[PDB]
Design a protein around this ligand. Sequence first.
Ligand SMILES: CCCCCCCCCCCCCCCCCC(=O)OC[C@H](COP(=O)(O)OCCN)OC(=O)CCCCCCCCCCCCCCCCC
Ligand SMILES: CCCCCCCCCCCCCCCCCC(=O)OC[C@H](COP(=O)(O)OCCN)OC(=O)CCCCCCCCCCCCCCCCC
Ligand SMILES: CCCCCCCCCCCCO[C@@H]1O[C@H](CO)[C@@H](O[C@H]2O[C@H](CO)[C@@H](O)[C@H](O)[C@H]2O)[C@H](O)[C@H]1O
Ligand code: SF4
Lengths: 70, 175, 83, 318, 106, 70, 156
Amino acid sequence: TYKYVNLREPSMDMKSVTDRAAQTLLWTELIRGLGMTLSYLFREPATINYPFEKGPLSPRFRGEHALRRY
Amino acid sequence: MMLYIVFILSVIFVMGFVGFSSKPSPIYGGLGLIVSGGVGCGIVLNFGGSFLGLMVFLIYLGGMMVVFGYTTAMATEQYPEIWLSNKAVLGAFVTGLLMEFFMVYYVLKDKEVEVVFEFNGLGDWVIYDTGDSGFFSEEAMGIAALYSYGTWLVIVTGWSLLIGVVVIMEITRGN
Amino acid sequence: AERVAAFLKNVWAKEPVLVASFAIAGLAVILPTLSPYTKYSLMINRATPYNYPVPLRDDGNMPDVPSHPQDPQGPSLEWLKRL
Amino acid sequence: MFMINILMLIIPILLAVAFLTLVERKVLGYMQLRKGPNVVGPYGLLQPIADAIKLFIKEPLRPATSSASMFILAPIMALGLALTMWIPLPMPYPLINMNLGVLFMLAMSSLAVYSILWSGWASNSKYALIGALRAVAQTISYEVTLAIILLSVLLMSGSFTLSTLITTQEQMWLILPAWPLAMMWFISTLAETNRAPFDLTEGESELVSGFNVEYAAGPFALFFMAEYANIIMMNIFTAILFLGTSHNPHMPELYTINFTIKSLLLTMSFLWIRASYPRFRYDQLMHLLWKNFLPLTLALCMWHVSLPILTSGIPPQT
Amino acid sequence: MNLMLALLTNFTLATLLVIIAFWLPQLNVYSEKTSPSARLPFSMKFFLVAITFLLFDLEIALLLPLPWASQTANLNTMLTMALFLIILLAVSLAYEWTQKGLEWTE
Amino acid sequence: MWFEVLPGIAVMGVCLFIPGMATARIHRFSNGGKEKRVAHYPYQWYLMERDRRVSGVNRSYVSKGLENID
Amino acid sequence: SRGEYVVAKLDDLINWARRSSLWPMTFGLACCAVEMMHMAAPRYDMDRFGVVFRASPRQSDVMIVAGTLTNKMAPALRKVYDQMPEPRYVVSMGSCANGGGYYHYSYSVVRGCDRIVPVDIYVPGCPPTAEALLYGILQLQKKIKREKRLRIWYRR
Ligand SMILES: CCCCCCCCCCCCCCCCCC(=O)OC[C@H](COP(=O)(O)OCCN)OC(=O)CCCCCCCCCCCCCCCCC
Ligand SMILES: CCCCCCCCCCCCCCCCCC(=O)OC[C@H](COP(=O)(O)OCCN)OC(=O)CCCCCCCCCCCCCCCCC
Ligand SMILES: CCCCCCCCCCCCO[C@@H]1O[C@H](CO)[C@@H](O[C@H]2O[C@H](CO)[C@@H](O)[C@H](O)[C@H]2O)[C@H](O)[C@H]1O
Ligand code: SF4
């Protein structure tokens, strides 16, 4: 099964043509992109405070070698 | 000495002209003209031409001379010969400053020199107008009158600029 | 017509910037000739006194020229106060 | 006394530029779900100082310049003109009260293109010169709309005096009657200062953009300071032009506080925009100017010449 | 006098910053390195954008007096000639546009 | 958090606030506690020169009122 | 007010500025460049230390060699190093850059970038974790903090 990613023909009535003209002239879709970056500004960042905080690891982690004893 | 600001500026004006008229590499020729233009605007300001002075900076320096330097970079020079490192350029430059120095010497000493015309060396301030108390700039009023008095000037000046666009596209197409 | 309306539709879909530019310029050239308040712009510019109003020598027969600034005769700026 | 006034303008300008570099990195950081400088000084407040010291004691670059005089003149011109743009600004009172202050600012900014041209000439590199010429072509192109837009707004103000814009907006911000001009003005200032999405001097389409390419340049810090001083100045000019602050003669400080906030917010919007959009192609930003802004700006100039006449709203001359 | 002092101060400081930006690194005494007209070729298009800027910029010189021109008594003449100038500026653009003077494709 | 951006903005704000505050205060210091006189046109400069003569101390910002009338 | 004291405090200042404002030129050659990119990404945010993400080689103070250096590439890496303004430092990231790694015995691979440029920090791993690289960068900062350029100059 397959889907088309870009095969929509725009409607050509006044209501739709004028909506696209408003987008062109009033930059509405550009303003929308500004909204997304503004929303991120008010999110808590993902940064950890290395070296006081450390990224999580698991017991399987492969690091520096060592020889063991009984 | 501030009372001879106009004369001092006009001396620098001539020195800049001797700059690019000795014709060093075009890169430095543009520099001499830019300095002369800036000094030239300064002289016009001190006669009450504020709008006219700023036109030089906006149109002559910020417009015409930018395009000259732009064209020089693309079509003429990319690196220059050292200024005054050529026999003719230096000899022409020395000759110009000697002539300027002597004109300045005699005009200041005798307060008058005579070459083609008679020049007085009392100081450019002596000719100024002694009556000023209007509520506007006379220069600005005269320039604003272009649109009321100068209909015919606008038409021919407007036509020439349009034809300039057409002509330059014709010239540069190459076929 | 309807050919004209279709053409206006094609440009409004393909060249909205130019349609707006020609519309705005068209208003700039047309509205001044139709506006009733254009006449007031000329009147206000003429009511602004840049120069001293030189007095006239009173020969004795200028009834409509005031002798004092606060006399009734002479041009009034009553229309401007209300405007 | 006047000499104090000059220094009380120049020095704070250099400090604002220094700390704008920190604000840009932290604002861009948080929009990218990170922090930005927060180690060098509390909240990164010492980061501008560390960068400044580091840059000035760094070795000068190679290769040698093609023209020593032009190599030295370009940074002097860039920084000298940048500081000069501030002297007529009414905040609310200007350092220099010019009757033609708006024209002065136009004239001085048109001279800022010379530092680009001279530094390209002094780069001793054919490809670096071609990059400079593309930058000049961008700068002068967008100067056309700035001049015409500015002329259109002044038809509502009535003069070229910067402090008259304050009186013009005593009742209402000029952005309401002129928001279409404000939109194109704001973008033109971005393109004029080579800011994203118009920062092609820092882009990927230049002949010199390759990392391994080299040409005579610098000092980096002085050019950087000049550029960021112009960003702030343009946004200050934008606030005065379209977001006029009310001035109370007995409390001038209130004007300054409100006027500073608006300028800061506009400056932050430059950072906002840099975080949000991809970069224009060179031919596409030329198309934006010559085939979009310019036709609309000419039409709106016609409108704003006609509108005051037909509404009987011509402003005063003095 | 004040404007001259301001310009002198601004370009004096710019000059000092430039020379110390060039001398201060010499305190380090870094080691020596010992390891490094004509067309450009220039495109006609880049020349034509500069020329077009100039001619458009000259027409802007004629439009700058418009704020003062609106104070005249002969408003009808002034408005007619103002719109005439801007329209010829538009006609210059239209001519450039329709002869592909604004293209960047070779 | 986003409010840790404010300290750098506050520093910027203070730096931008200083030139405007300084100019206003220096003007009032130098013109007898009043705004510096604006003379854009010859008439205004003509009156300023007259005030400098009328003051008797060669400062145009020293005002003489009805006390000088007699 | 001895010269030893002033020289000592001036060293601390310039050392502080240089380590607090380290601009890397990342030479992303292979896989290790991905981990270098995860050091710039939000979790570790190298920029918060004053280490700007993407800096031009003209303003860079440190070159990070992140990946395998092949023979065909060695001349171009040396050229970038020679064009870096001083003071300049090199961090060797990952087994390939450290000594050849998995490709040590190849006919086409330089067996460690320290045959081409002098290296200040070696970061082990294949690849080193983003945190391991950050540890190495912070190690370089402490190495810069220990520098004594002016003290040595004063005693010449
Ligand atoms: C009563 C009648 C009165 C008469 C007057 C009436 C006038 C009102 C009607 C006209 C409206 C005018 C609108 C003014 C904006 C200019 C419009 C414009 O030119 O934008 C279109 C331009 C090209 O768009 P594009 O889709 O790429 O291609 C079209 C051409 N083929 O694309 C763009 O310009 C997009 C912008 C490019 C830059 C993107 C990055 C910046 C985006 C963020 C900006 C945020 C808003 C800034 C506001 C600042 C305000 C201070
Ligand atoms: C550093 C950050 C500083 C900020 C600090 C925090 C305060 C945040 C304040 C910022 C406000 C903007 C942020 C929110 C923007 C996001 C909102 C949004 O996404 O709206 C999208 C909307 C729909 O767009 P679309 O889906 O394409 O629909 C098309 C057909 N309906 O699209 C629209 O409807 C757009 C409608 C507006 C179009 C206006 C066009 C520009 C006109 C310019 C006037 C500018 C006036 C303001 C300038 C400032 C002066 C106050
Ligand atoms: C008293 C003040 C003294 C002046 C102090 C000046 C301090 C300057 C600190 C700059 C801080 C780093 O700021 C950051 O620098 C890099 C340059 O490497 C810029 O980087 C930008 O320009 C370079 C080219 O020049 C491009 O390669 C890069 O892709 C682009 O993003 C960032 O846009 C900027 O956000
Ligand atoms: S060291 Fe490992 S991860 Fe890094 S480039 Fe070599 S093979 Fe890839």
